[PDB]
Design a protein around this ligand. Structure first.
Ligand SMILES: Nc1nc2c(ncn2[C@@H]2O[C@H](COP(=O)(O)OP(=O)(O)OP(=O)(O)O)[C@@H](O)[C@H]2O)c(=O)[nH]1
Ligand SMILES: Nc1nc2c(ncn2[C@@H]2O[C@H](COP(=O)(O)OP(=O)(O)OP(=O)(O)O)[C@@H](O)[C@H]2O)c(=O)[nH]1
Ligand SMILES: Nc1nc2c(ncn2[C@@H]2O[C@H](COP(=O)(O)OP(=O)(O)OP(=O)(O)O)[C@@H](O)[C@H]2O)c(=O)[nH]1
Ligand SMILES: Nc1ncnc2c1ncn2[C@@H]1O[C@H](COP(=O)(O)OP(=O)(O)OP(=O)(O)O)[C@@H](O)[C@H]1O
Ligand SMILES: Nc1ncnc2c1ncn2[C@@H]1O[C@H](COP(=O)(O)OP(=O)(O)OP(=O)(O)O)[C@@H](O)[C@H]1O
Ligand SMILES: Nc1ncnc2c1ncn2[C@@H]1O[C@H](COP(=O)(O)OP(=O)(O)OP(=O)(O)O)[C@@H](O)[C@H]1O
Ligand SMILES: [Mg+2]
Ligand SMILES: [Mg+2]
Ligand SMILES: [Mg+2]
Ligand SMILES: [Mg+2]
Ligand SMILES: [Mg+2]
Ligand SMILES: [Mg+2]
Lengths: 461, 54, 461, 461
């Protein structure tokens, strides 16, 4: 009748929880070469990444710069929501406008504006070339960086400096090969695209072709723009934030909570899925059990994020006594999500590339990276020297169960510097490809079927 | 054994200590869905290994 | 012919400078008991302190609270100038209004004010009871804290709560004994003072008598208000600041510069001396040589402050290569100041109470305390607990040679907590009295005649 | 005109003070073997020690046990005064009654005393045998430990247990050889000494002869009793204490103050010298200058104790800024005391046996040992074990300038254990004999003529 660990209830201690340090991947029969392993995996039901890594929605990790770098490297970034709605939507617009096959609404000016006004617009949009349109809206010329750098009078009007028409233009529906051929034939960097009446419709640049050459792994939509995601909370303010982010062109909305097994979180996920589910993917917040993941799947989540107090010395574990070891949490959530084709994102507790391999082997489809990217060059903050060491120096946060609530008030800052993001991503992908080679996994979907060996405490000495 | 014990370190006012402890308890109640202490007495544990203490 | 340290110029290495660690006070014939030694000393030519200690004009040391505490303990506080002119003059007013023989400009309300507005006035001025005057100027009542505390409705007019006239009042020129006898006979705390016409002219409180009995060492003017000093820089902004501070009732102005051997500083000292010299005393900034002290005396300074890079690992020493050991600097400055009766304030480099005694024995009249007071309860800042330890948390600074120009941009704060100011002052004064007993110095002027023994490096191991 | 270290006064810095670490003894022409070096020296004008060492009058160093052990080793002990007058006089009596050539007031019982009363008297006086006298005063027998150890009945009277007369006795003034021969012939440990009437006058024991053989270097008066010293302060309580101690049989009185250059201390020395000078020697308290030593010599002191803040990190140096390096202080005091034949006792700053040699070579006649003896088994306290280590666990103090007035309240205790006193004394005397061998000094008076070499800071690395 009694339980060996105490009491008369055998379900009081429901499980033994394994963390990353408890397991190792077993070698298996392999013809897979590490350099030829396919590391592509599903982020949501509709979005597939070339590198199964996403950066966290933390204010020390992902802003527009980190999102652009992650999308270029084959992953994706999730923009944090610790800021006003308009500023977050502006960061989304910055990421979506970084590059494209064709600029659909290019920034234009008028012949009357002074060169200082064009300078201000160039600074505001971080571009250097503008087509010029009059009151009638007809294309009259183009003013670029070459014209302006050779003019001292900043009060001159555009008409006196601009390259007047006829310009090298192209018609709507022009092929990329033909557009690039025109650009190289005339030795120009810009090519406006016009309709049948001669009105401006778009702009094609050489720099977009060069960027496509330089970053062949980029995560992009059908228009050639980088994909980005953004985090929202729960409540009416979160609804307005989500609608603004959807207008700005976000691709993924992550309902980001510390404890998603809540009726409010599930209702928010269902509401967003009904409202904008045709366009954007909705990802459910952090869960750690099978029942919570099943509830999120029932609510219509396109992916389930897993982890609740996954770190060993975690503040949730110390202050509230609440946690779930991450390997067991991933196994339990995958048991609920896999029959419906809903991907799992492992969020938290990753220290090494081996942990990424173990998390993918346990069943997750992607890993979300936090502290591993906090000190990179692309992360927010300014780079400063202190005692010969390099560091990175820097209303919302409405989650009642978030760790910032549990921690006492104080000061934190001066995260260390870690170098460029590309080297970190290269090292992590190298570890993952080595694991795929050892396990004989040609794809991530095959890696999700690999076996573990459980090790004892002596194996960690 | 016979000896000397003394000089306990100072810890501040009692109110902040009680506030911190009750805040942690309320966070646990929110995580487990326990509206009262009697419901908190029905919550489940997960046992962790030694690697969970490092 | 060549100098043994190199070169041919024997004045290239001008002197050997002694710091505090190099010297000790020699015991001499003594009949002085440490408890009956007289530690009074001149701060300026006209101001004598019971305890020869002054707090530094640093934004982590002296604000109104520290100034009040220092003046009550027998010293004085100098308010820092790292703040707007209005805020500094307001802190001057806060110190001057802490206590007096008779409040000569009492705060009054009108019979039509409401209890919320009277409560707001009490909040603004940190008082609790107001006399009431009508548009005629006649005293018709008084409303104090007992009247307000029992009234739940804060919208009631004063005329419905106030104690109506006739009140317990007294004529101008009443002796203190008579006023206290009236206050005790009628068992009240406040006594309005009116002229022959019954128009309100002042107020006398029991709290002032209690404060006078409680702090018998207080530094006070002829009106019984606490003395205070403030720091000013150089320039036109400094002139406006100095005039404002004089209007607010400051008693000492300190032209506080890192390098006072400069025409600008000398001209500022002369200007203040000619403008406001009959009311306030003017103290010249930091010098380290005989010639600079002589220049300040010729300019007309009432006291001379001494110390330029006086600490061993000072930032001025490391970054600029400039400094002066403090014992030698004090000796050189006193050689210029003593024949004219100008007191010397030793600023910087003090670590222990023995150093205070040594500074006074070298010829200084007062010591200025910085870091030794930064962590006390009366210094600016809020008290917090960080990891089991107690810490104190927290356009101007236009001095071209100040240390903040030399230290790189960075972060500072969280000074350690050090307890109440009274215990620190007690310990320092006890050390000074012990030194006076050892050297046979009944007064500070006799301590200024004591002899030193120079010790070697082995005596510092 | 200017002094190179500052100011115009060349006497402001009077001297350069040498400590022990600043000097070494230079080897000189020698024919002295360390084993045959004579280490005897004068403590006062009338007392010569075989080992020139005295233990400090500290409550952690010298009580009756330490004083007895020191006097047996050839030095002397000074009983501390941090205790009631009766208890210090009792400790003086304990030391003086430890051994003698002949016991002059032997403890006696009466035939009607029970065995329990005799046991109580034995424990009180720490003896084991008693002569028995009647009301007539005739010696009626003797009861020793042998008689009592075989008695089960504690309630019996002495007359039934004692060895009845006739006893083996001797006449007054019997020689040492005759008394010891009579003791050995009858195989007894005790020999009463009687007068012409046969009334008891004294007692001779074999244990005293054995002690004289066992400790041949003992410091003794003419009666064969060990010498002891005791400290007094200043005041009328101190005068009463001094008179009580002189009655108890003290040999040296030390007016023990932190600063003896005081009229109170000098007048106390003169008073004691005039009242009890012919019986006991008076030693003057701590000085550090030639003038103070000259004043003590004029007051009539028989020895002068030297040292005021001699330790490098002494509390007097840190808190009051007062001190004097010990080598220079000894040289200065000897310059005043030697022409008058007054010995100098060096007190404080001694860490090694080499320091003892340096202090004697500087001119001192004896060294006072403080912290070097606090851990020894003979020092007061109880030996205990804590964490595998051995430690020694433990109204007055009117000296206004003492270190305990300077140090804040807190916890001091648990001095570490250091072993038996004899080993420490042996090590120190071996060092001193090696120094005498190197310098060619046959006596301490020749060692006082040895030369020093001053070393630089590089010699201490
Ligand atoms: N000119 C322009 N570029 C835009 C606009 N919106 C986004 N972009 C992107 O900005 C990049 C072009 O920036 P520009 O500064 O104009 O570059 P460029 O002068 O053509 O090229 P470089 O001389 O190689 O820098 C391309 O990747 C465009 O897709 C827009 O309105 N105008
Ligand atoms: N009432 C009053 N006190 C003033 C004013 N300005 C300065 N003070 C000082 O503030 C103190 C009186 O403050 P209150 O709290 O009003 O005095 P109280 O009610 O008599 O004092 P308690 O003993 O605290 O009840 C005295 O030291 C006054 O000298 C003023 O305008 N009104
Ligand atoms: N018997 C005795 N000894 C005294 C007295 N006062 C001091 N002493 C000293 O104490 C020692 C003798 O102590 P006892 O215990 O009687 O010695 P004992 O029994 O002869 O000696 P052992 O048996 O060898 O220990 C000698 O050193 C005496 O000088 C006294 O009143 N009586
Ligand atoms: N489509 C076009 N038709 C005609 N002239 C053009 C066109 N695009 C650019 N120009 C003109 O050609 C010149 C070079 O412009 P281009 O866009 O090639 O580079 P740029 O941004 O001006 O130069 P850079 O990036 O080297 O500073 C400018 O004088 C510009 O006005
Ligand atoms: N001079 C005065 N003449 C008449 N009434 C007075 C006078 N001073 C005070 N009172 C009245 O006496 C009462 C007690 O006020 P008092 O100033 O003595 O203390 P309080 O500051 O109001 O209260 P407490 O200090 O005890 O909290 C009040 O009702 C007040 O209006
Ligand atoms: N002078 C004496 N004449 C005669 N008998 C004596 C004399 N002194 C001691 N005795 C006795 O001789 C016996 C031996 O005593 P002794 O003094 O030799 O040693 P003790 O101190 O009694 O014993 P222990 O052997 O423990 O030291 C005792 O019975 C004692 O009473
Ligand atoms: Mg360009
Ligand atoms: Mg270019
Ligand atoms: Mg009141
Ligand atoms: Mg009151
Ligand atoms: Mg015996
Ligand atoms: Mg025996």
């Amino acid at each position: 009748v009694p339980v060996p660990t105490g009491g008369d209830d055998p379900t009081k201690v429901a499980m033994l929880g394994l963390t990353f340090d408890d397991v190792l991947l077993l070698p298996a029969a392999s013809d897979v070469v590490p350099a030829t392993a396919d590391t592509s995996s599903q982020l949501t039901k509709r979005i597939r990444l070339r590198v199964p890594l996403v950066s966290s929605a933390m204010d020390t990790v992902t802003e527009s710069r980190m999102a652009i770098a992650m999308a270029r490297a084959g992953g994706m970034g999730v923009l944090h929501r610790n800021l006003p709605v308009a500023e977050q939507a502006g960061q989304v617009e910055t990421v979506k406008r970084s590059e494209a096959g064709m600029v659909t609404d290019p920034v234009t000016c008028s012949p009357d504006n002074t060169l200082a006004e064009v300078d201000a617009m160039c600074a505001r949009f971080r571009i250097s070339g503008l087509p010029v349109v009059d009151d009638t809206g007809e294309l009259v010329g183009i003013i670029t960086n070459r014209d302006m750098r050779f003019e001292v009078d900043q009060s001159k009007p555009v008409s006196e400096v601009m390259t007047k028409a006829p310009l090298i233009t192209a018609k709507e529906g022009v092929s990329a090969e033909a557009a690039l051929g025109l650009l190289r034939r005339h030795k120009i960097e810009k090519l406006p695209i016009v309709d049948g009446h001669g009105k401006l419709t778009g702009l094609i640049t050489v720099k977009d072709f060069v960027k496509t050459e330089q970053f062949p792994l980029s995560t992009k939509d059908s228009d050639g723009r980088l994909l980005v995601g953004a985090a929202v909370g729960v409540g009416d303010d979160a609804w307005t934030r989500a609608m603004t982010l959807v207008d700005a062109g976000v691709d993924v909305l992550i309902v980001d909570t510390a404890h998603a097994h809540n009726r409010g979180v599930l209702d928010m996920v269902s509401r967003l899925k009904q409202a904008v589910g045709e366009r954007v993917d909705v990802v459910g917040g952090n869960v750690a059990t099978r029942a919570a993941a099943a509830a999120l799947v029932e609510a219509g989540a396109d992916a389930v994020k897993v982890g609740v107090g996954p770190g060993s010395i975690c503040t949730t574990r110390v202050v509230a006594g609440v946690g779930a070891p991450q390997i067991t949490a991933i196994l339990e959530a995958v048991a609920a999500c896999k029959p419906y084709g809903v991907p799992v994102i492992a969020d938290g507790g990753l220290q090494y590339s081996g942990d990424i391999a173990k998390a993918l082997a346990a069943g997750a489809s992607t890993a979300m990276l936090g502290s591993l990217l906090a000190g990179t060059a692309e992360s927010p903050g300014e780079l400063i020297f202190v005692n010969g060491k390099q560091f990175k120096s820097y209303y919302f946060q409405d989650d009642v169960l978030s760790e910032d609530k549990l921690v006492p008030e104080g000061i934190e800052g001066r995260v260390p510097f870690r170098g460029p993001l590309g080297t970190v991503i290269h090292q992590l992908t190298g570890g993952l490809r080595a694991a795929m080679g050892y396990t004989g996994s040609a794809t991530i979907e095959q890696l999700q079927q690999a076996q573990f060996v459980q090790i004892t405490a002596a194996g960690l000495k």
